[PDB]
Amino acid sequence: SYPSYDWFQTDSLVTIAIYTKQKDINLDSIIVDHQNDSFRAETIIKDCLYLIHIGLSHEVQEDFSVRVVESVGKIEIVLQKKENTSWDFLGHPLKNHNSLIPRKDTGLYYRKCQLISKEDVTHDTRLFCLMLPPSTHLQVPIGQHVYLKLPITGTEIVKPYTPVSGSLLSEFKEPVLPNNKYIYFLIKIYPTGLFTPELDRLQIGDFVSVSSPEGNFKISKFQELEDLFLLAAGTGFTPMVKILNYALTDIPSLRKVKLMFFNKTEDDIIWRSQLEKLAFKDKRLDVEFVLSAPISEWNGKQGHISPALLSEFLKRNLDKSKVLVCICGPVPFTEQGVRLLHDLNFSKNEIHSFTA
Ligand SMILES: Cc1cc2nc3c(=O)[nH]c(=O)nc-3n(C[C@H](O)[C@H](O)[C@H](O)COP(=O)(O)OP(=O)(O)OC[C@H]3O[C@@H](n4cnc5c(N)ncnc54)[C@H](O)[C@@H]3O)c2cc1C
Ligand SMILES: NC(=O)c1ccc[n+]([C@@H]2O[C@H](COP(=O)([O-])OP(=O)(O)OC[C@H]3O[C@@H](n4cnc5c(N)ncnc54)[C@H](OP(=O)(O)O)[C@@H]3O)[C@@H](O)[C@H]2O)c1
C-alpha cells in the first residue's frame, strides 16, 4: 500500500492531492517549495520520503495553501493560476518525481530565506530571525535542526543550527499559527570559526540557504511525562528552548521541569533573565546555573558536569514517575553526561542526547 497523488483544476486554481495512506499525517509531515514554474513537495512517510517534483505547465502565484485531512492522510496543495486558463496537463515530472526513498538515503534540499533581524543576546551570541519565502511551506519540529549554507570565495559552506522559539515568555512568544514563516536561531559567533563570522557579516535583508529539517527526536517521548530534566552546556541550550515551551504548555501530566545550564561566565548565560522570570512565575520549572570559570562574585554552583552534581539534581523521589533526561552540549560533555546517567540507572528510553 504505497503513497500516490492526483491533481485537478478550476478556472483559477490548481490543486495537487497527495494520498499518503497514513494515519498521523499533519502539516509537519510535508515541505513544499515552488518557483513560478516548478513545484516540489516532500512528505515524511514513516522512515521514507515521498517526493512530488514537477515543472508546472503554466505559472502560478507565490501564495498557496496546504491542508491535511488527518483521518486518511490526504494532503492538498492549492496553487493559484497567474492566468485563468485551462491546463492541458499538470507538467513535466522532474528529478525523482513520484519516488519513495528511505530518509537515510536522501540528500538535503535547500531554499533561500531572508535575514529579518539580529539581536545581541550575550556578548558572542545573537538571536537571528529568518523568514521563509512566500512560496515555501516548512515547519521545523521540536528537537530537530536545519543546515544553513552561505557562499564564500570558491565554494559554499554549511553548518547545522537548531531553531528556537522567539522567546520563552508568553508576552513575546508567537501564537500557534497555521503556517509560521519565521524561524529563530540562537547562534554563538566564534572569531576563529569558519561559518559564524560569515553569518555575522550578513546584512539585514540578505539571504541564507536553509535545508529541510533533520533529527531523530520524536515528540512522543513526551507522552504522559511527569518529570523532565534538561542538561545543557553553552549553545546546547538551543534544543531545550522549544522542549521547555512544550513542557510547560502541552503536557498536562507534567509535575516538574528542571534545567541545569552549564556555562563559563555569568556573561555567557544565554537568556538568563528570561529563564529567571519564567522559573519564578511557574513553580513547575526549576533552573540552576553552573559556572566553570566565574569572573565575579558568584554564590551559585561551580564546576563541570560530575557524578556529584547529577546525584543531587536527579535525586530520586519516593514515588515512581515517568522521566526523561535530555542532554546537549560539547560532544565530550554529552558523552560523559550519558555515561553518568547510565551509572545512575537511567535507561536508554529515559535519555535523549542531542548530537550530530
Ligand atoms: C545538530 C547540531 C545543532 C547545532 N545547533 C547549534 C545552535 O543552535 N547554535 C549554535 O550556535 N551552534 C550550534 N551547533 C554548532 C554549530 O553547528 C557550529 O559547529 C558552530 O556554529 C561553529 O561553526 P564555525 O564554522 O563558526 O566554527 P568552527 O570553524 O567549526 O570552529 C570554531 C572554533 O572553535 C574551536 N573548535 C572547533 N572545533 C574544535 C574541536 N574539534 N576541538 C576543540 N576545539 C574546536 C576552535 O577554536 C575553532 O576555531 C550545532 C551543531 C550540531 C551538530
Ligand atoms: N544537537 C546538537 O548536536 C547541538 C545543538 C546545539 C549546540 N551543540 C553543541 O554544543 C556545544 C556548545 O559550545 P559552546 O561554545 O557554547 O560551549 P562553551 O561556552 O565553550 O562551554 C560551555 C560549558 O561546557 C563546559 N565544557 C566544555 N567542554 C567540556 C567537557 N569536555 N566536559 C565538561 N564540560 C565541558 C565548559 O567548561 P570550560 O569552562 O572548562 O570550557 C562550559 O562551562 C557546541 O560544540 C555545539 O556544537 C550541539
UniProtKB/Swiss-Prot annotation:
GO molecular function: cytochrome-b5 reductase activity, acting on NAD(P)H; heme binding; metal ion binding; NAD(P)H oxidase H2O2-forming activity; oxidoreductase activity, acting on NAD(P)H, heme protein as acceptor
Signal peptide: none
Domain FAD-binding FR-type, first and last residues per copy: 108-220
Localization per record: Endoplasmic reticulum
Enzyme Commission no: 1.6.2.2
Membrane-spanning segments: none
Residue numbers binding FAD: 200-215, 227-259
Origin: domain of life: Eukaryota
Listed GO biological process terms: bicarbonate transport; cell development; detection of oxygen; glucose homeostasis; insulin secretion; reactive oxygen species metabolic process; response to antibiotic; superoxide metabolic process
Alphabetically ordered keywords of this record: Acetylation, Endoplasmic reticulum, FAD, Flavoprotein, Heme, Iron, Metal-binding, NAD, Oxidoreductase
Tissue: Widely expressed.
Result, substituting D206Y: In a breast cancer sample; somatic mutation
Catalyzed reactions: 2 Fe(III)-[cytochrome b5] + NADH = 2 Fe(II)-[cytochrome b5] + NAD(+) + H(+)
GO CC annotations on file: cytoplasm; endoplasmic reticulum; endoplasmic reticulum membrane; perinuclear region of cytoplasm
Segments forming domain CS: 1-91
Cofactor: FAD
Role summary: NADH-cytochrome b5 reductase involved in endoplasmic reticulum stress response pathway. Plays a critical role in protecting pancreatic beta-cells against oxidant stress, possibly by protecting the cell from excess buildup of reactive oxygen species (ROS). Reduces a variety of substrates in vitro, such as cytochrome c, feericyanide and methemoglobin.
Family the entry assigns: Belongs to the flavoprotein pyridine nucleotide cytochrome reductase family.
Protein name from the UniProt record: Cytochrome b5 reductase 4
Residues of the full protein shown: 166 to 521 of 521
